[PDB]
Each structure stands twice: as C-alpha cells, then as structure tokens.
Design an enzyme around this catalytic site. Structure first.
Site, PDB file in Angstrom:
ATOM      1  N   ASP A   1     -24.988  13.795  36.807  1.00 29.05           N
ATOM      2  CA  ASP A   1     -24.214  12.644  36.377  1.00 29.05           C
ATOM      3  C   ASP A   1     -24.033  12.698  34.861  1.00 29.05           C
ATOM      4  OD1 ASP A   1     -23.100   9.988  36.146  1.00 29.05           O
ATOM      5  OD2 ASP A   1     -25.127   9.270  35.703  1.00 29.05           O
ATOM      6  N   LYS A   2     -22.998  12.017  34.370  1.00 33.60           N
ATOM      7  CA  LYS A   2     -22.734  12.010  32.934  1.00 33.60           C
ATOM      8  C   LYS A   2     -23.384  10.810  32.249  1.00 33.60           C
ATOM      9  CE  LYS A   2     -19.060  10.126  31.225  1.00 33.60           C
ATOM     10  NZ  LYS A   2     -19.564   9.332  30.072  1.00 33.60           N
TER      11      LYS A   2
ATOM     12  N   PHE B   1      -2.373  -2.773  27.362  1.00 36.43           N
ATOM     13  CA  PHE B   1      -2.855  -1.410  27.187  1.00 36.43           C
ATOM     14  C   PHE B   1      -2.641  -0.640  28.484  1.00 36.43           C
ATOM     15  CE2 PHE B   1      -4.709   2.287  26.033  1.00 36.43           C
ATOM     16  CZ  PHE B   1      -6.051   2.488  26.283  1.00 36.43           C
TER      17      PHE B   1
ATOM     18  N   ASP C   1     -16.738   8.442  35.819  1.00 39.08           N
ATOM     19  CA  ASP C   1     -16.061   7.944  34.633  1.00 39.08           C
ATOM     20  C   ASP C   1     -14.681   8.584  34.492  1.00 39.08           C
ATOM     21  OD1 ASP C   1     -15.638   6.587  32.215  1.00 39.08           O
ATOM     22  OD2 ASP C   1     -17.736   6.857  31.627  1.00 39.08           O
TER      23      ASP C   1
ATOM     24  N   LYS D   1     -19.124  13.426  45.198  1.00 37.84           N
ATOM     25  CA  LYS D   1     -20.176  14.133  44.477  1.00 37.84           C
ATOM     26  C   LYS D   1     -20.973  15.021  45.421  1.00 37.84           C
ATOM     27  CE  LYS D   1     -21.030  11.087  40.542  1.00 37.84           C
ATOM     28  NZ  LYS D   1     -22.150  10.598  39.699  1.00 37.84           N
TER      29      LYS D   1
ATOM     30  N   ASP E   1     -28.511   8.961  37.655  1.00 37.33           N
ATOM     31  CA  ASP E   1     -29.061   7.614  37.661  1.00 37.33           C
ATOM     32  C   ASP E   1     -28.109   6.687  38.402  1.00 37.33           C
ATOM     33  OD1 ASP E   1     -26.994   7.471  35.726  1.00 37.33           O
ATOM     34  OD2 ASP E   1     -27.985   5.777  34.746  1.00 37.33           O
TER      35      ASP E   1
HETATM   36 MG   LIG Z   1     -24.952   7.221  35.598  1.00 40.16          MG
END
Ligand SMILES: [Mg+2]
Ligand SMILES: CCCCCCCC/C=C\CCCCCCCC(=O)O[C@H](COC(=O)CCCCCCCCCCCCCCC)COP(=O)([O-])O[C@@H]1[C@H](O)[C@H](O)[C@H](O)[C@H](O)[C@H]1O
Ligand SMILES: *[C@@H]1O[C@H](CO)[C@@H](O[C@@H]2O[C@H](CO)[C@@H](O[C@@H]3O[C@H](CO)[C@@H](O)[C@H](O)[C@@H]3O)[C@H](O)[C@H]2NC(C)=O)[C@H](O)[C@H]1NC(C)=O
Ligand SMILES: *[C@@H]1O[C@H](CO)[C@@H](O)[C@H](O)[C@H]1NC(C)=O
Ligand SMILES: *[C@@H]1O[C@H](CO)[C@@H](O)[C@H](O)[C@H]1NC(C)=O
EC number: 7.6.2.1
Lengths: 328, 1035
Positions: free
Chosen positions: B379-380, B510, B648, B743, B763
């Site tokens: 994960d990032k 935006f 993300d 994932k 996480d």
């Molecule tokens: Mg995370």
C-alpha cells in the site's frame, strides 16, 4: 501494542558464540594425526591377533569320508565320534573352549523373543504361568514348561571331551572347568532360581521339562550352584547371538600348575557325544580352542581396518593439502 | 435484475437477497473438529502417521508400541488445531462487534434503534455524523442544503479525505421529514451485486416517474458520514451483497513452499518404504521356504505357508522402518517455528518507540518463507507515507522562504502547532507587515478552497476533499489567516485575530482537466478579488504581460520539484465593479442546464481567469515514513520487486514513486494507454518495457486489460499472461485507483503466472484482501480499526522494519529450517536403515538392530536438543552483515538449501552412514570380538555398539552442521552423548562398553562415518565457497 521487549542476549539473537571455519590449519592436522594413530593401532591389533593360537574343528560330519558321518542318522540315540587333530604350537596361559554353530539364526525375531525373562529371573507367579512370548512351548501336556520358549527348548546338548595322545598312545584326560563361563550379571542378576525351599526338586514342582530336553532342569549340573536357571551352559545359550555364525563358551582350561604349556603340542582327540542335529538346515557344529591375549581375543578385521582407514586418512590429508595449496 | 421495495420486508420473500449480518469466521462450535479433514488430507504425513497408528493397533502385525505414535500425533495435530481455534475465535469477536453495531431503522411510522443484523434490502435508515454506513444505501435526504453528504471511504480506499455525495433532486425536497420517509414507497430496479465501487447502474421508480441513479447517490458499507448532522437512505445491498464484502476474500490456509517440498519428497520416502518392505517381505518368503521350513529350532506351531509369512512381516517392516518418515520431524518443526516467531516479537530493531508497538508474529507457521519472497505488494498511504501532508516551503512574491534561516506561533491563538515550519524571516515579515504580498499570499490559501470547518468542542478542525487544500488552509491558519467558518453566501476569515467576514460572489469549481480553482470575493470596502490557485502549467497560460516575477517563480518551482514536493501557483485579480456585474449576470445564465452546462461553464470559466498577477507558489510535502527509500533500495539489492498497490490517485501515487526513488529520471513511465497498445500488439503477432522499467496503471485500466465461451476463456488466460509478463519486466509497478479485490487480483496474478512467493504489506481494511491473498501478509500498525493488522501474518509499525523481517529474520529462518530438515532426515535414515541391513543376517525376520528402549528414545533424548538449538540459534553472518549484504537473500529466493538434490544427498548420507554403522560392527563380530566369559559377541553387544556409534556419529554431524557455536549449542551436542552414555551406566549395555575392542570398534565406525564428511565439507567450500563463507572468512 505493548511495552518494550527486554534486552537479553537470547531474545535479541546476540548470544556469545564461536564461528568455526573449516580452515586448512584445522582439518589437515586431524586428517594426519588420525592417520598417525590409526596405523600404529592397526599394527598393534593385527600383530596381537596373529599372535593368538587357535584351532577350529568342524565335527558335524555332513560330508562323507569323515569319522562322524555315522551320527547324521543315529539309529541308536547315543552316538559318538572321534576326531584326531594335532597342535603344532603349544598353547600358553588360559585356553577357552568354545563351540561354534553356523547357519543357526539365533537372532530370528520369532526366536529371540521366545522367552520369559520374568521366569528366568525367578518369579513364582511366572514360574507356573509362562507368557505368550514362549507360546509354542508354554506347556507340554497339562502343566507348563519351566524353561519355556524356542530358545531354551533348542539348547545345545552335545558333550565334548579332549584327550592328550601322548608318547604312550594312552589318552590322558584334560581338565575342563564349566564354571565362570557366563557373565557375572547373568549368574547373579539376570538369572535366578525360584525362591523358597532348599532342594531344586520341589522348587520346580508341577513344571514340565522342555520337549527337546532329554532331562529336566532340576539337576543340569551336580553342583547345586550350577543347576536350575543358574546353570552356566543354559545361561550361555540363552544369551542369543547377533549373527547366524557364532561361537559360545563351553569350558575353561586354566593355567597348568607346572610351567609347561597348558595344552602341549602333540596329538589330540576330540571325543564328542553327537546329540544336536544341525544338518537339516545345513548348519555346521564346531569346537574352538583359543588362547587369551592381553588385548582380548582375535580380530584381524579391526586391525586391518585401522590400517586402511588410517592410511586413507593420511592420504586424504595429502590430497586435501594439494587441493588447498592450488586454491590458496 | 435486483429489485428493492422501500418499507416492504415481504416484497421478495416469496433467499436471493441477503440479511445485513456478516459471517467472516470459518468454523462453528460443531464443524471445527472436522478441521482434521484439512490437516489430515493436505499433509500426507499425518495420513501416514494415522496409518501407522492403525497399523500398530492390531497385535497380529506389530513390532513397536502404539502409545509412542499417538502422543506425538496428538501433539502435532493438537497444536495446529489450537492455533486455528484462536484465529477463528478472534474472527467471531470481530464479526460480533460489527454485527452488533447500532443503526436507526424505519419501523412502523417511526425511526427506532436497531443493530446492523436487522437491516435488510428495502429498509430506510437514518445515519448521523461520524456513523458507519451499515449497507449500500441510496442517499435520500440530508441535514444540509440540496441533500448533500460528505463521506470518508477509508475502507474502500486508504484515503482519509472526504468524498462528495448528492441525492436525487426529487427525493431531496420531499423526504426531508421523518413522516414522509416512513410512508415512502420507492421501487428500485438496479444492478446485481458486484465488487465495483466506482460504478452503479440503476433507477428509482417513484411518483409514476423513473429517475436514473449513479454511484454519487449510493453510500457504501465501508464508509463513514462526516460534515453533516444526519442523512437518510434505503438499503439496496445488505450484509454480503454489499460491495465492501464482494471486495473481500476467503481466509485461506497459508503453508510455506518448504512445506510443499517436504510433501513431495515425503511421497518418495513412502515409495522407498513400501519397496523396501516388499523386497524384505519377499526374501522372508524365500528364506522361510528353504531355511525356515527345514529349521527345527524355528518351529512355533501354527503352520503358515511361506507366502503368508512374507505377507505378515511386510507390515512388520513398515513398523520397523517407520522412522523413514519420523513423527519427531513435525513435532520439532513446531518448536522451531514457534521459537523463530518469538524472535520477531522480541526484536528491538523492529520496535517503534513512540507508539510503543513492537513487531508481532501472528502466524508462527510461515517464518522460513520470509526468506523466500520474490515480490512485495505494498500500500502507498500509511505504509510508504505517514498520512501527514504538511506545508514545507513557499515562494511568496519573489523570495523563497522556509529555508530554516532567521517558531512559537503564540502571536495567533488559532495555530494548532502541527506545522513544523522553521524559517523565522517569514514570521517576522508577517508580523512586521512591510510587504502586502505576504499577507495576500496566505489570505489566498485560507479563502480559495473547498475545505470545511468542524468547530466541535471549540476546536477549529478542517476537513477537505483534497489533502493538498487541507494542508494549505492549515498553513495559512498557523500564519494567522485562520479560516473561521463559511456560510452559503459569505466566507469568514480571521487576520491576526481580527474578525473579517467576507462575502463570496462566485466559487469556480475544480476539475481534473481544469487543474485549477478560483474564488471571487468582494471585500467589505467593495473591491472584488479573483483569488485563483491551480497547477503550474495551467496558471502560467493565463498571465498578464506585466508579471515580472514569472521567471523567478518558475525557478522556485524547479527547486521545489527537485525535492519531489507538490506545488501550486497562487494569483489574485482586481475585477472592476461594472465588469463583474455584467459577468455575474452572464455567470448565472451559465449555471442553468441549457444544453450541457459544460461547454458554457468552461467558456465563462476561461474568460474569468485571464491576466492574473502572480504571488508565487507553495510547497506541500507528503511525508514518507522514515527509512522508506533506504528500505526500497536495500530490498531491491536483494532482488525483491516492490509493487505499490494504492486506492489513491495517479498523481499522488506517481509523486510518491519519485519520493521513494522507485521511479527515477532514468525510468520512462508507461501508462494504461501505452500498455494496451503493447499488449494488443502481442496478440496479433521480451516486452520492450524490459527497458522502460516503470508502470503506472489505474484500476480502471486493469479491468480493461484483465477484461473483468471456450474461445473467450482462451483469450482471458492469454491477456492475463501477457500483462503479468509485461508488468514483471519493469523495475517499478504502481497500480492506482484499485479496489480491495483488484489489489488481491494483482497479487494472485503474480502467484499463478510467475510461481513467485509474494508479500503484501499495508494498513487499513483496503489491504486486507491482498494481505490475505499473498504468501506472506504484513499489517502496518496505527489504524484504530486494526483490520490489516488482525488479518496479517506479521504486524510491525514502520515500513523500514521490512529490512530485518526479510534479510535477518527471514534469511536466518530459511537457513535454520533447511539445515534442520536435511540433518533431521539424515539422522533418521541412518538410524532406521540399520534394520534393513540386518535383515540379510536374521532371516529377514524384522528383528531390530537396537534395543527397544533405544528406538523409543532416539529422537526424544539422544538426537533432539542439538538440532532444535541449531534451528533457533544458527546464523551464518551477523544481523549487521545480513543488512550490509542483501545479496545473501538470493540464497533462499533461488531455493538452494532444500531441493530434490539436497534432499537425496541427505538420503545417500544416511544410507551410507547406516551401511557403515552396521558393517564395521558386523566385521568386528564376525571375527569374535574380545572372546572371554564376559564377551561372547551377543546380540545386546551388537545392538549397544551400533547405537553407541550412531549416537556419537549423528551428534558430531550436527556439530559440523552448526556454524553459530553458542554455549547452549556446545552443551547440547556434548550433553546428548553424555546423557546417552549416562543412561546405560546405572545412571548388558555397560558390559560391552568396558572393553577395548568394543570402543575401538565405535571409534573406527564414528571416524569412517564422519572423517570422510569433513573432506567433502572442506573440499566443497575451498573449491566452491559460498557468499556466507566469504563474508565469514573476511569477518
Ligand atoms: Mg493505507
Ligand atoms: C544434557 C543435554 C541434552 C538433554 C536432552 C534432554 C531431552 C531433550 C529435550 C528437549 C528437546 C526436544 C525433545 C522432544 C523431541 C521430539 C519428541 C518426539 O518426537 O518423540 C516421539 C515419541 O515420543 C513422544 O511421544 C514425545 C512427544 C511429545 C514431545 C513434546 C515436545 C516438547 C518439546 C519441548 C522443547 C523445549 C525446547 C526448549 C529450548 C530452550 C518420537 O517418535 P519417533 O519419530 O522416534 O517414532 C515414531 C513414533 O514416535 C513411534 O515410535 C512409532 O514407533 C512410530 O512408528 C514412529 O514413526
Ligand atoms: C538333544 O536335543 C535335540 C534337539 O535338537 C533332541 O532331539 C529332539 O528330541 C525330542 C524328544 O527327545 C523330539 O521330540 C519328539 O520326540 C518324539 C519321541 O518321544 C518323536 O516321536 C516326535 O516326533 C518329536 O520329535 C524332537 O523331535 C527331537 N528333535 C530333533 C531335531 O531330533 C535330542 O533328544 C536331545 N538329546 C539329548 C541327549 O539331550
Ligand atoms: C583317530 O583316533 C582313533 C583313536 O585315537 C583311531 O581309532 C582312529 O583310527 C583315528 N583316525 C584317524 C583318521 O587318524
Ligand atoms: C568318549 O566318551 C564316551 C562317553 O563317556 C566314553 O564312553 C568313550 O569311552 C569315550 N572314548 C571314545 C568314544 O573313544
């Protein structure tokens, strides 16, 4: 999560240690000191083994043109043989009388366990209640067999005597002791007579003899200290053999009171009461006379083995030395 | 097609739906014991040990006590069963906690408290602020204008920012009140349940009119309501039909590659065992035919034909040769595994001091697989980064600030103190007020934004949909320009503690393509300011010719870019009174739908933001975790490939790719558009991306490539195979906008199409599916939910602790396991094959060459401790040298220390050791060892000598195997022999060992077994030294 781990050598994987590396300064020596210890030992054993006088007579008589073939089929149950042999070199010191059996698998699984050690230990409860271990020989007709089992049943029951054929051609009898031919522990610990009484006859009451035994266990020897379960010949037999070809101690020839050799060189006759049949399974009976040595008995295998292993260790070190130097 | 009827619990009860309760656990109070099905069948050793237990039960064919194989089998099965019971009972608590969660439901005419289980499809619910969404619901109304809702999808993706959600226009104005919600009867014919989180197809039938629905009106289960007092919605998918649960995987049982290797190499021992026993059984039938039938001394009644005697001992020889596969191997591996796990628990270099969270080995079975990892899928956010995103530097006017040159922030009470700004000149300039550009710069940050205020318990918290804006508003707040609050018509901002409520006349929106935002605000005096903020490229396209700071700010941006910082350009304007009035009328005419509202809005948007005055740029730092770039380089040297799987955005993921140094200026970035052409080209015909080395793909493009008839299935495997080939020919791969199931799909793809050992680290709940899917799963600690932590094999806090888990703990666990397995088999094949050799000298009667007491205590007392200590303490190199040389990790990656060749080499070693241990004593007693009244070469002496030589030989071999000679290692090797020779010396066997020929026989046997082994061990290292040896030599 939870508090800090405690700082210990074991838990932190930092226990003090040595990292031995097989370096040429450590393996090459042990490959040479071994070769320098194994060769002298190999020579010492080999020379001592070849310094042992020993004679082995095969008196089964299976092959014809031998003076014992008549006992292969003993029409009369008491059969006797006479084998004459000559001892070139006089035996010295104590001489041991072994008998040898070949192709007699005393290590067989069905045979090794065919005993009741509790009864041999002298247990009253097991005296009249043989265990299932000695199943085929628990009882003969109504009451149990005292030495039950295939082991005690198939006991060696030949008799051997030796005479010295002297200059007069009259056979001199040769003393043969039957005591002290078994382990001390076997006589006094492993084997015992049933408790109680004073005479062995009543102790073994209501117990049949083994079927193959010609006579019961009450009076295996005239001496009460060598009869019953503590008989030397019976004890030696029950101590089964590791391999089919084995020899068991029969009699002791102690040092003669005179300085002369215990068995002076000359003509000897083996007078044997042929009783044990072995020719059915191609087994060979033998009688062995051998002399004691300060390093035990005779074993040219070991002495040669250290010579081979000791020599190879010396040569392997040289080969390892050359390989190391080229790759230094 | 799905069908939902609001306020109708009996509409489709006439099975297809699901109740809103979740069953994550795997066992009940009854079907747990059938776990034996999984334990017994998967590991054939347990089945073989079960056969032995049965085979030793019948007295007809028995040679060894069955009490000695029931007790260890119970231990082997019991501990593994106990481990899975604690794992499952934990899943019972988490399921119960979720199921007992509280929600309000439309009962008959009113809203009443209810649990998450009682919710069902077609049920109208009311959710408050900070309340978990209990199901995939359709937003019906909200407490704020236009039925607007902000929701945090922290379990769908790992992002903590807010997501905008709007309800249908028709339902907004009617279902505001509880009364209308209770009587509301809306029929929905929507999509069937699926794992898609971004797309929703359906319609609402109500008031004789059909209204289309989108994912913006649907709140999903794994979300949380924020910045809205309450909201209302009707459940569409409940319990297991929810997209969060369709984005989840089964808790499979994880077993190491070495475990599969022992399985296949224990099959061969079974073949050897059966073939040996059958061959010995045949010989007994032939032996009993000739020698046994004519042997009177062997008569035992119960005449059995020789064929039956051969049949009988076949099972006797299985029992005699049973330790070809010993039960002690699996009893001792559990000791090795448990001890190796506790070193991870006890490590101080994987202990995070400030959070007081050490590493945890939640699964003790996979320790040696940490030394096998080929790929890492990480994960990032929260794993590579910290979820802290602060304001680091700024170029205001022309000068660059935040250079640590020459903070208290006490001059303004609003400053929370989070900002770690060091430069003091900026603070001096703000208070001094000698330059209006400084005040104008931070004003823009605190006004031009979409962030929202909390003002809960007197705390001025800020929640934003864009993490960039939230940091900028926080930065301006710390510098006195505190954004106090905002209503629809006006925005309130505090300047140096002075209240200043301004009225906003327009808020330019935006967009991803727009890449900018502006806000038009009229000052209290009357002046109109067009405060604009946007991307570097777009802003410079709209600059007035007067701008003299254009070049300087561009230079400042380059400085910030080199630091991989996020930068935004700031601008205002001075729109006139009449000019805005003409435009304000025009702007309103563009807000109406008209035809599309996009072309018109873009047109008026373009004209608003022309001829702007630059103020400079900002610099936001998305903080990495400490030691992350060091970790990625260290593991890359170990030939471990690190893939970033993130929910993300692409831009944030790519920015962290450069910050982590996963991507460098050497790498050329390949995108989904580039990948598709390359994959398509291969169909119509190693990949050129072997040189490109970078891969940035979106979850949307994964479906296009993965494409998620027989000929169609042929293309499915083909397209998946080509993608894995391409993605594996790349130094870095970053998958973005991926759902929790996507994932795990990527992790699965590498597993199936590369046979690679995979690690998954992350996480939050977004990563639980891939943490459960990978061969190893790591959970970063810090999430209060603790969903990745409680679904992981290991769980520490810092990403940098991956260095010690893999290179130190995983590397040693592989060395200490393969060493354990090779010796343990060796010591038991040498032990048991002495019976095979003795068969040729005892009638093939299955007589054992050792006393019965030796056979039971061999693997218990005489060869047990030394191999366990070597499996818990053996290090080839130190931990410092383990990290200093990551190339030592390739030893396990390539499967070098345990193989068919390595295994069979220990078969030969055991075979030759049994041969020597039987035939040197045989020769020494074929020639009448030490003949006397006290040593007639009995069977006990034969048994005692081979056992005596066996114990010494094997205990010396482990000494040569051990490289880390700790005192406890020395004490065990010598104490095992001392214990052995102490047991048979009154604390038979003693009589043999008092005689020189017996001892010189053992010395000859031990040397002939060991002394050759030293030659190969020394010769092999000298000619073919290992990397560990070279480091050890140079240590
Ligand atoms: Mg995370
Ligand atoms: C002085 C220094 C040395 C002291 C040395 C002190 C002593 C050593 C102390 C600790 C080291 C570990 C000892 C246990 C070794 C494994 C035992 C075993 O497998 O025995 C098995 C049988 O014995 C048992 O029933 C014991 C089972 C319970 C063991 C409990 C484990 C506790 C570990 C604690 C570690 C602490 C460790 C702490 C570390 C800090 C062996 O079976 P088998 O493979 O030989 O033959 C099998 C089967 O068993 C049947 O025989 C049957 O015939 C079948 O066909 C056959 O296949
Ligand atoms: C020395 O030991 C041998 C055993 O090798 C004895 O031979 C065995 O003698 C018993 C009985 O004396 C035999 O058992 C049964 O004998 C009856 C006759 O009573 C016979 O008809 C049965 O067929 C049955 O065999 C046994 O078969 C026999 N075994 C062999 C191989 O001959 C021998 O008697 C012993 N001699 C002395 C002097 O101790
Ligand atoms: C063996 O000796 C006996 C008597 O001593 C004698 O009768 C017999 O002929 C001898 N046999 C041989 C072959 O010398
Ligand atoms: C051999 O021993 C028997 C038994 O005591 C004896 O009768 C015989 O005279 C001895 N000598 C022989 C057979 O030459």
């Amino acid at each position: 999560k939870t508090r800090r781990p405690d700082n210990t050598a074991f838990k932190q994987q930092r226990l003090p240690a040595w990292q031995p590396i097989l370096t040429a300064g450590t393996v090459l020596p042990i490959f040479f000191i071994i070769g320098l210890i194994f060769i002298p030992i190999g020579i010492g054993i080999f020379v001592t083994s070849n310094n042992i006088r020993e004679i082995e007579i095969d008196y089964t008589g299976t092959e014809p043109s031998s003076p014992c073939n008549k006992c292969l089929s003993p029409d009369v149950t008491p059969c006797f043989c006479t084998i004459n042999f000559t001892l070139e070199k006089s035996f010295e010191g104590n001489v041991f009388m072994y008998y040898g059996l070949s192709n007699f698998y005393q290590n067989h699984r069905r045979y090794v366990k065919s005993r009741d050690d509790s009864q041999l230990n002298g247990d009253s409860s097991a005296l009249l209640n043989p265990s299932k271990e000695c199943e085929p020989y628990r009882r003969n007709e109504d009451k149990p067999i005292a030495p039950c089992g295939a082991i005690a049943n198939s006991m060696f029951n030949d008799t051997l005597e030796l005479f010295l054929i002297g200059n007069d051609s009259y056979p001199i009898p040769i003393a043969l002791k039957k005591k002290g031919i078994a382990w001390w522990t076997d006589k006094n610990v492993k084997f015992r007579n049933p408790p109680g009484g004073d005479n062995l006859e009543e102790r073994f009451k209501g117990t049949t003899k083994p079927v193959n035994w010609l006579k019961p266990v009450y009076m295996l020897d005239s001496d009460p200290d060598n009869n019953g379960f503590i008989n030397e010949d019976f004890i030696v037999w029950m101590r089964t053999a590791a391999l089919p070809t084995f020899r068991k101690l029969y009699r002791l020839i102690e040092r003669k009171s005179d300085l002369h050799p215990t068995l002076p060189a000359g003509r000897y006759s083996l007078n044997v009461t042929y009783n044990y049949p072995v020719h059915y399974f191609d087994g060979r009976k033998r009688m062995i006379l051998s002399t004691i040595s300060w390093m035990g008995g005779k074993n040219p295998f070991l002495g040669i083995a250290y010579i081979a292993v000791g020599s190879i260790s010396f040569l392997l070190g040289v080969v390892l030395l050359v390989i190391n130097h080229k790759y230094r | 097609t799905w069908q939902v009827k609001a306020n109708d619990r009996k509409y489709h009860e006439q099975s297809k739906y699901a109740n809103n309760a979740i069953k994550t656990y795997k066992y009940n109070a009854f079907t747990f014991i059938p776990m034996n099905l999984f334990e017994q069948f998967k590991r054939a050793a347990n089945l073989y040990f079960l056969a032995l237990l049965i085979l030793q039960a019948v007295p007809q064919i028995s040679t060894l006590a069955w009490y000695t194989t029931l007790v260890p089998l119970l231990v082997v099965l019991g501990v593994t069963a106990i481990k899975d019971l604690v794992d499952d009972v934990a899943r019972h608590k988490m399921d119960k906690e979720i199921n007992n969660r509280t929600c309000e439901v439309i009962k008959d005419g009113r809203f009443k408290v209810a649990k998450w289980k009682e919710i069902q499809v077609g049920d109208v619910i009311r959710l408050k602020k900070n309340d978990f969404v209990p199901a995939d619901i359709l937003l019906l109304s909200s407490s704020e204008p236009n039925s607007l809702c902000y929701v945090e999808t922290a379990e769908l993706d790992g992002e903590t920012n807010l997501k905008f959600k709007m309800s249908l226009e028709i339902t907004d104005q009617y279902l505001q009140r509880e009364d209308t919600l209770a009587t509301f009867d809306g029929f929905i014919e929507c999509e069937e349940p699926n794992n898609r989180l971004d797309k929703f197809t359906g319609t609402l039938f109500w008031r004789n009119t059909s209204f289309p629905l989108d994912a913006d009106k649907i709140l999903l289960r794994g979300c949380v309501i924020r910045n809205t007092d309450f909201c209302h919605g009707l459940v569409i998918f409940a319990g297991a039909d929810t997209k969060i649960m369709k984005n989840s995987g089964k808790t499979r049982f994880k077993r190491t590659k070495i475990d599969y290797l022992m399985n296949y190499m224990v099959y061969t021992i079974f073949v050897v065992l059966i073939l040996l026993s059958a061959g010995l059984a045949i010989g007994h039938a032939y032996w009993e035919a000739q020698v046994g039938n004519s042997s009177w001394y062997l008569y035992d009644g119960e005449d059995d034909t020789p064929s039956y005697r051969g049949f009988l001992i076949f099972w006797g020889y299985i029992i005699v040769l049973n330790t070809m596969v010993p039960i002690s191997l699996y009893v001792s591996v559990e000791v090795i595994r448990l001890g190796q796990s506790h070193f991870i628990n006890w490590d101080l270099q994987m202990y995070y001091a400030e959070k007081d969270t050490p590493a945890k080995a939640r699964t003790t079975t996979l320790n040696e697989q940490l030394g096998q990892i080929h790929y890492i899928f990480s994960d990032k956010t929260g794993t590579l980064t910290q979820n802290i995103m602060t304001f680091k530097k700024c170029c205001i006017n022309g000068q660059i600030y935040g250079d640590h040159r020459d903070v208290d922030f006490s001059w303004n009470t609003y400053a929370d103190g989070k900002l770690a700004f060091y430069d003091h000149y900026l603070i001096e300039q703000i208070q001094s007020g000698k330059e209006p550009e400084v005040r104008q710069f931070f004003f823009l940050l605190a006004v031009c934004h979409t962030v929202m205020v909390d003002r809960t318990d007197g705390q001025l918290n800020y929640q934003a949909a864009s993490p960039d804006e939230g940091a900028l508003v926080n930065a301006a707040r710390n510098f006195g320009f505190a954004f106090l609050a905002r209503t629809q018509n006006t925005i309130t901002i505090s300047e140096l503690g002075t209240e200043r409520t301004y009225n906003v006349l327009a808020i330019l929106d935006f967009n991803s393509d727009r890449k900018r935002m502006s806000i038009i605000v009229r000052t209290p005096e009357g002046n109109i300011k067009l405060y604009c903020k946007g991307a570097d490229t777009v802003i410079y396209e709209r600059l007035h010719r007067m701008n003299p700071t254009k070049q300087e700010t561009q230079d400042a941006l380059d400085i910030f870019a080199n630091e991989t910082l996020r930068t935004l350009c700031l601008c205002y304007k001075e729109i006139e009174e009449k000019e805005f009035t003409e435009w304000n009328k025009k702007f309103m005419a563009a807000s109406v739908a008209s035809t599309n509202r996009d072309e018109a809005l873009d047109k008026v948007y373009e004209e608003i933001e022309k001829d702007l005055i630059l103020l400079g740029a900002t610099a936001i730092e998305d903080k990495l975790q400490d030691g992350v770039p060091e970790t990625i380089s260290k593991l890359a040297k170990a030939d471990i490939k690190i893939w970033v799987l993130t929910g993300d955005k692409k831009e944030t993921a790519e920015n962290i790719g450069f910050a982590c140094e996963l991507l460098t200026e050497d790498t050329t970035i390949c995108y989904g558009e580039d990948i598709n052409s390359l994959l398509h080209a291969r169909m119509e015909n190693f990949f050129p991306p072997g040189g490109n080395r970078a891969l940035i793909i979106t979850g949307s493009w994964l479906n296009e490539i993965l494409l998620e008839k027989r000929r169609l299935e042929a293309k499915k495997e083909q397209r998946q195979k080509n993608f894995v080939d391409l993605a594996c020919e790349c130094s870095a791969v970053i998958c973005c906008r991926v759902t929790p199931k996507q994932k795990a799909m990527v992790v699965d793809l590498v597993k199936r199409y590369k046979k690679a050992i995979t690690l998954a680290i992350g996480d939050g709940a977004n990563d639980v599916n891939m943490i459960k899917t990978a061969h190893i799963g790591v959970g970063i600690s810090g999430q209060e939910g603790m969903q990745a932590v409680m679904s992981s094999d290991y769980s520490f806090a810092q990403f940098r602790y991956l260095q010690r888990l893999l290179l130190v703990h995983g590397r040693w666990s592989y060395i200490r396991m393969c060493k354990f397995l090779r010796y343990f088999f060796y010591k038991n094949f040498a032990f048991t094959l002495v019976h095979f050799w003795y068969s040729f000298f005892n009638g093939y009667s299955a007589q054992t060459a050792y006393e019965d007491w030796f056979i039971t205590l061999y693997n218990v007392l005489y060869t047990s401790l030394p191999v366990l200590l070597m499996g818990l303490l053996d290090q080839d190199v130190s931990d410092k040298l383990s990290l200093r040389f990551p190339g030592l990790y390739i030893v396990g990656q390539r499967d070098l220390l345990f193989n068919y060749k390595r295994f069979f080499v220990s078969l030969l070693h055991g075979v030759l050791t049994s041969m020597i241990l039987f035939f040197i004593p045989l020769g020494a007693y074929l020639q009448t060892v030490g003949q006397d009244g006290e040593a007639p070469s009995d069977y006990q002496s034969f048994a005692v000598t081979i056992a005596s030589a066996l114990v010494i030989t094997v205990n010396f071999q482990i000494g040569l195997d051990t490289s880390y000679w700790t005192f406890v290692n020395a004490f065990s090797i010598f104490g095992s022999i001392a214990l052995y020779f102490g047991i048979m010396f009154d604390f038979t066997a003693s009589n043999a060992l008092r005689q020189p020929y017996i001892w010189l026989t053992i010395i000859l046997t031990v040397a002939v077994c060991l002394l050759p082994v030293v030659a190969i061990r020394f010769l092999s290292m000298t000619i073919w030294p290992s990397e560990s040896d070279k480091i050890q030599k140079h240590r």
